[PDB]
Design an enzyme around this catalytic site. Structure first.
Site, PDB file in Angstrom:
ATOM      1  N   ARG A 115      -3.232  -9.224  11.094  1.00  0.00           N
ATOM      2  CA  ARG A 115      -3.759  -7.886  10.898  1.00  0.00           C
ATOM      3  C   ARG A 115      -3.225  -7.208   9.665  1.00  0.00           C
ATOM      4  NH1 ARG A 115      -2.330  -3.157  11.829  1.00  0.00           N
ATOM      5  NH2 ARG A 115      -0.200  -2.444  12.219  1.00  0.00           N
ATOM      6  N   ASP A 124       5.123  -5.246  12.189  1.00  0.00           N
ATOM      7  CA  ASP A 124       5.629  -6.570  11.858  1.00  0.00           C
ATOM      8  C   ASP A 124       7.107  -6.653  12.207  1.00  0.00           C
ATOM      9  OD1 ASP A 124       3.384  -7.973  10.847  1.00  0.00           O
ATOM     10  OD2 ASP A 124       3.452  -6.745   9.024  1.00  0.00           O
ATOM     11  N   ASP A 154       4.202 -11.475   8.534  1.00  0.00           N
ATOM     12  CA  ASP A 154       3.147 -10.964   9.408  1.00  0.00           C
ATOM     13  C   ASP A 154       3.098 -11.577  10.796  1.00  0.00           C
ATOM     14  OD1 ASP A 154       0.685 -10.600   6.730  1.00  0.00           O
ATOM     15  OD2 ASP A 154       2.320  -9.295   7.402  1.00  0.00           O
TER      16      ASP A 154
HETATM   17  N1  LIG Z   1      10.544  -8.652   9.717  1.00  0.00           N
HETATM   18  C1  LIG Z   1      10.652  -8.028   8.535  1.00  0.00           C
HETATM   19  N2  LIG Z   1      11.869  -7.956   7.908  1.00  0.00           N
HETATM   20  C2  LIG Z   1      12.020  -7.332   6.709  1.00  0.00           C
HETATM   21  N3  LIG Z   1      10.938  -6.773   6.127  1.00  0.00           N
HETATM   22  C3  LIG Z   1       9.703  -6.806   6.691  1.00  0.00           C
HETATM   23  C4  LIG Z   1       9.528  -7.454   7.942  1.00  0.00           C
HETATM   24  N4  LIG Z   1       8.258  -7.345   8.259  1.00  0.00           N
HETATM   25  C5  LIG Z   1       7.636  -6.674   7.289  1.00  0.00           C
HETATM   26  N5  LIG Z   1       8.523  -6.344   6.329  1.00  0.00           N
HETATM   27  C6  LIG Z   1       8.184  -5.582   5.079  1.00  0.00           C
HETATM   28  O1  LIG Z   1       7.219  -4.556   5.395  1.00  0.00           O
HETATM   29  C7  LIG Z   1       6.146  -4.533   4.447  1.00  0.00           C
HETATM   30  C8  LIG Z   1       4.874  -4.803   5.254  1.00  0.00           C
HETATM   31  O2  LIG Z   1       3.800  -5.118   4.368  1.00  0.00           O
HETATM   32  P1  LIG Z   1       2.385  -5.531   4.954  1.00  0.00           P
HETATM   33  O3  LIG Z   1       2.496  -6.660   5.893  1.00  0.00           O
HETATM   34  O4  LIG Z   1       1.407  -5.821   3.902  1.00  0.00           O
HETATM   35  O5  LIG Z   1       1.958  -4.229   5.725  1.00  0.00           O
HETATM   36  P2  LIG Z   1       1.076  -3.932   6.974  1.00  0.00           P
HETATM   37  O6  LIG Z   1       1.531  -4.725   8.154  1.00  0.00           O
HETATM   38  O7  LIG Z   1       1.159  -2.473   7.230  1.00  0.00           O
HETATM   39  O8  LIG Z   1      -0.412  -4.395   6.534  1.00  0.00           O
HETATM   40  C9  LIG Z   1       6.472  -5.610   3.414  1.00  0.00           C
HETATM   41  O9  LIG Z   1       6.985  -5.053   2.191  1.00  0.00           O
HETATM   42  C10 LIG Z   1       7.531  -6.496   4.056  1.00  0.00           C
HETATM   43  O10 LIG Z   1       8.433  -7.105   3.124  1.00  0.00           O
HETATM   44 MG   LIG Z   2       1.199  -7.273   7.839  1.00  0.00          MG
END
Ligand SMILES: Nc1ncnc2c1ncn2[C@@H]1O[C@H](COP(=O)(O)OP(=O)(O)O)[C@@H](O)[C@H]1O
Ligand SMILES: [Mg+2]
EC number: 6.3.3.2
Length: 164
Positions: A115, A124, A154
């Protein structure tokens, strides 16, 4: 393809939905939710969310279903620019594994159930704490399907309930 770009696309489309069109799409989707939860009586605490930018809405007969089957609803609250927690109506905080199911809002999802959110990545980080095999269910409108590639951080989501 690019996340940021895809967000903008879908985002504009969802803000075009008719008030009547949307209410109908939501009716089909909420019906499925009820259908999904009926044969799952071990789900007693469930995570929902508060519809914001024209997201799928949880309707009245859905909340009645939960009320009559004694299924507690918990909502997300942010505490930092990266952390989110869940609480019940009486503001009591529920730990990740006190929740049995998650209905997750979204801006987009692809063919492999990943997603797309608003970017902060709250879910996440949070969903990574589940250890009870709790269903991770995305809530969406059919047209929120998109072709983007999942990043390593993700969380995948077990299913995507939409209008079809
Ligand atoms: N488990 C995690 N540990 C550290 N950083 C995370 C983790 N999960 C997500 N992130 C950070 O959070 C941000 C989420 O980005 P993204 O997946 O594109 O957003 P969204 O889920 O809102 O679409 C990224 O910069 C990522 O590095
Ligand atoms: Mg994501």
């Amino acid at each position: 393809m690019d996340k940021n770009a895809l967000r903008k696309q879908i985002l504009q489309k969802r803000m075009a939905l008719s008030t009547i069109e949307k209410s109908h799409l939501d009716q089909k989707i909420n019906q499925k939710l009820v259908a999904f939860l009926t044969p799952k009586p071990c789900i007693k605490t469930i995570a929902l969310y508060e519809p914001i930018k024209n997201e799928v809405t949880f309707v009245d007969f859905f909340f009645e279903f939960l009320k009559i089957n004694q299924i507690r609803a918990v909502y997300p609250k942010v505490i930092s620019d990266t952390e989110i927690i869940f609480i019940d109506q009486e503001t009591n905080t529920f730990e990740p594994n006190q929740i049995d199911c998650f209905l997750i809002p979204l801006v987009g999802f692809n063919k492999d159930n990943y997603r797309l959110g608003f970017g902060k990545g709250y879910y996440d980080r949070y969903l990574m704490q589940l250890t009870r095999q709790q269903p991770k269910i995305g809530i969406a409108y059919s047209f929120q399907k998109g072709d983007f590639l999942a990043d390593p951080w993700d969380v995948q989501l077990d299913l995507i309930i939409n209008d079809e």
